[PDB]
Each structure stands twice: as structure tokens, then as C-alpha cells.
Amino acid sequence: EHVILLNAQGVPTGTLEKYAAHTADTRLHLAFSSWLFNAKGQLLVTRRALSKKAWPGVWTNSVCGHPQLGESNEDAVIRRCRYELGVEITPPESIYPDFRYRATDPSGIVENEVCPVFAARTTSALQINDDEVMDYQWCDLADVLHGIDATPWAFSPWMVMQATNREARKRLSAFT
Amino acid sequence: EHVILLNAQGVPTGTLEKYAAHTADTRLHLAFSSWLFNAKGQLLVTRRALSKKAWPGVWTNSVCGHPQLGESNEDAVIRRCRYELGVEITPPESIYPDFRYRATDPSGIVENEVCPVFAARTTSALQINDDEVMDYQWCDLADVLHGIDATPWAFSPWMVMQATNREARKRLSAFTQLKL
Ligand SMILES: [Mg+2]
Ligand SMILES: [Mg+2]
Numbered sequence: 108e109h110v111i112l113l114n115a116q117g118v119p120t121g122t123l124e125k126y127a128a129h130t131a132d133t134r135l136h137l138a139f140s141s142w143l144f145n146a147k148g149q150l151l152v153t154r155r156a157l158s159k160k161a162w163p164g165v166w167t168n169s170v171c172g173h174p175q176l177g178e179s180n181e182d183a184v185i186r187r188c189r190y191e192l193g194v195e196i197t198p199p200e201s202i203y204p205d206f207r208y209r210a211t212d213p214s215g216i217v218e219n220e221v222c223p224v225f226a227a228r229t230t231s232a233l234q235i236n237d238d239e240v241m242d243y244q245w246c247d248l249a250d251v252l253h254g255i256d257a258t259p260w261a262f263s264p265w266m267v268m269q270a271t272n273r274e275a276r277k278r279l280s281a282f283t
Numbered sequence: 284e285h286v287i288l289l290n291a292q293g294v295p296t297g298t299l300e301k302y303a304a305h306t307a308d309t310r311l312h313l314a315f316s317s318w319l320f321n322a323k324g325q326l327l328v329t330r331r332a333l334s335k336k337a338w339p340g341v342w343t344n345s346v347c348g349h350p351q352l353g354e355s356n357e358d359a360v361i362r363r364c365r366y367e368l369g370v371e372i373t374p375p376e377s378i379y380p381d382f383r384y385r386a387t388d389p390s391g392i393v394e395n396e397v398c399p400v401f402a403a404r405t406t407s408a409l410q411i412n413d414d415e416v417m418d419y420q421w422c423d424l425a426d427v428l429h430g431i432d433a434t435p436w437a438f439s440p441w442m443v444m445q446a447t448n449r450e451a452r453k454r455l456s457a458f459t460q461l462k463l
């Protein structure tokens with residue numbers, strides 16, 4: 108697996124192996140984030156495995172990943188929902204297309220990404236990949252937003268930035 | 284380094300080396316938990332290091348640990364505040380002395396403890412020990428309590444159990460006063 112390097116404009120200029128790409132000095136690259144809801148309207152929140160290179164052990168939205176060369180953002184979402192969560196989903200819908208951020212995790216590992224955000228509904232049961240996810244919770248979206256607003260430090264910085272974008276929050280609120 | 288083993292009633296019977304004591308089958312033993320506030324009345328929340336045997340990488344209250352043989356619980360608080368956080372404190376106040384709990388962590392490691400709870404003020408700057416603590420934040424107690432109520436699963440279960448005890452919570456609230 109690789110990540111796709113982006114120039115100042117969002118143009119792909121090459122690739123790097125995925126593990127080697129994320130360092131104290133991570134360069135700008137393409138990613139996605141997704142929020143998954145079940146048929147009941149509950150939000151799936153996940154806790155990243157302790158083996159993840161970046162933000163291990165952190166509570167975050169449902170599934171995040173790195174599209175490969177030639178892959179649509181939506182196909183990447185579907186791919187990592189299968190890979191991390193063993194779950195089938197409805198066609199991903201855009202909720203924050205221009206999100207981009209840079210942040211540094213407690214051990215100094217950086218994420219530096221153009222990261223469009225999506226939402227979808229699960230259409231099967233989860234089957235957890237414990238190399239990716241160490242814990243998870245189905246919850247009411249209102250409660251998760253209350254937690255992000257009171258104690259944002261308890262959640263990943265990109266989950267917070269997404270959830271505190273006024274429009275993204277309105278659009279997420281429609282899946283419940 | 285060890286733990287003090289306790290029998291079915293709260294009475295000590297001996298010691299056990301600490302790493303070895305915490306397994307899937309942990310026997311009841313003595314511990315403490317502490318909530319630390321700075322002069323402004325902010326609460327220190329901390330994130331356990333990824334190397335901790337139990338609840339690694341988990342957000343929790345300020346400092347927790349295990350008194351050693353010959354140590355008062357209050358001296359254990361002082362010592363672990365120095366070791367984990369590098370910080371000096373005012374005399375720890377007992378705010379939940381009969382707290383006792385048993386819990387399994389995400390890996391299956393069990394904590395089984397008689398765990399009196401304290402609160403204190405810090406009187407020096409921090410010198411965080413990264414072998415024990417991987418992140419921290421100074422917070423308004425009101426906000427922490429709101430987060431615990433909205434998403435309790437995102438924090439250590441012992442922090443949540445202590446915070447929702449009415450009596451202990453009133454003492455926490457008393458420490459949010461600004462003190463010069
Ligand atoms: Mg991922
Ligand atoms: Mg400790």
C-alpha cells in the first residue's frame with residue numbers, strides 16, 4: 108500500500124510506501140475520513156489499535172484511510188470498511204469535501220492530509236480486524252457531539268475538526 | 284516494587300511483585316487514585332502511556348498507584364505524583380475512602396483493588412514522565428464531568444466510577460476554587 112503525495116495545489120506528484128510515509132515530518136498526501144451509521148441511526152465510533160503508527164489507542168470516527176493511485180474516494184471507503192471492520196455499506200455520501208489538516212500525535216508522528224469526509228450506512232454486521240481496531244462503540248450522535256464539545260482532547264484531532272465544522276455537523280445529523 | 288494483598292475483607296495478608304500481580308487473575312490489593320488541581324482550580328487529566336500493562340493509552344484522572352510496604356496512602360500519592368508527573372502537592376485530602384472496584388481492561392488484564400481516592404493541589408510545574416504518561420490536559424472540571432456523562436466509554440472506568448459518586452464529586456468541585 109502507498110500514499111499519494113500532493114503538491115500545494117492538490118495535484119498528485121508521486122507515492123510513498125504507507126508506513127514509511129508517516130513520520131515526525133509527514134509530507135502532504137491524500138486521505139479520506141468516514142462516519143458510519145447503522146439502520147437505527149447510531150454512530151459507530153472506533154478506538155484505533157495500539158499498533159497503529161499514528162494516534163494508536165485513540166477514539167475516533169468510524170474509518171479513515173488512504174486512497175491508492177487510480178482509486179475513487181468512495182471505493183477507498185468501501186475497501187477500508189471491509190478491511191478494518193468487515194462491513195458492507197451504502198454508497199458513501201460527501202459531507203465535508205474540502206477538509207484538510209495537519210496534526211502531531213503524542214509520540215511526534217504527524218498526519219498531513221487533504222482528507223475529504225464521507226458518511227454511509229452499514230448494511231451488514233461488523234467483523235472486527237484487531238490489527239486496526241481495539242475497541243468500538245455504537246452511540247447516539249448527539250451524545251458523541253456533546254463529548255467532542257466538552258472534552259475534545261479525548262478524541263482524535265481530525266474527528267474534532269470535522270465534527271465542529273458547522274456544515275459537516277448538519278449533514279451528519281441527517282443520518283440519525 | 285510490589286502490591287499489598289488483601290483478603291476477602293479489607294485486611295492485608297502479604298505482598299506480591301507488581302508486574303506479576305496484574306494478570307487475568309489479579310488478587311485483591313491496595314491502590315490509591317488521586318485528582319490533582321492547579322492553583323487556578325483546573326483539573327489535571329492524564330493519558331496512560333502505551334507501555335502501561337493495564338489500560339495503556341487511556342484517558343483518566345491525575346495519578347493512580349500502589350502503596351508499598353511501610354508507606355501511608357498519602358505518602359504513596361506524593362511519591363507517584365513525583366514519579367509520574369514530577370509535581371509537588373499540598374496534603375492529599377481523602378474524598379472517597381471506601382472506593383473498591385474490579386475491572387477487566389481491553390487486553391484482559393484485571394485490576395482488583397481497594398482504592399481510596401484523594402484530591403490535592405499542585406504547587407510546582409510539571410515534569411511529565413513519558414514512561415508513565417503520554418499526554419495530559421488542564422481542564423475545567425465541569426467540562427470533564429460533561430464528557431464523562433456523554434461518552435463514558437472514552438475514559439477509564441475507575442475515573443468514571445469515582446466522578447459519579449456524589450460525595451466525591453462535591454469534593455472535586457471544592458477544589459475548582461482559585462487559590463493563590
Ligand atoms: Mg484506517
Ligand atoms: Mg500510576
Ligand SMILES: [Mn+2]
Binds near residue numbers: 110129138219
Ligand atoms: Mn496519512
Ligand SMILES: [Mn+2]
Binds near residue numbers: 305394395396
Ligand atoms: Mn493494581
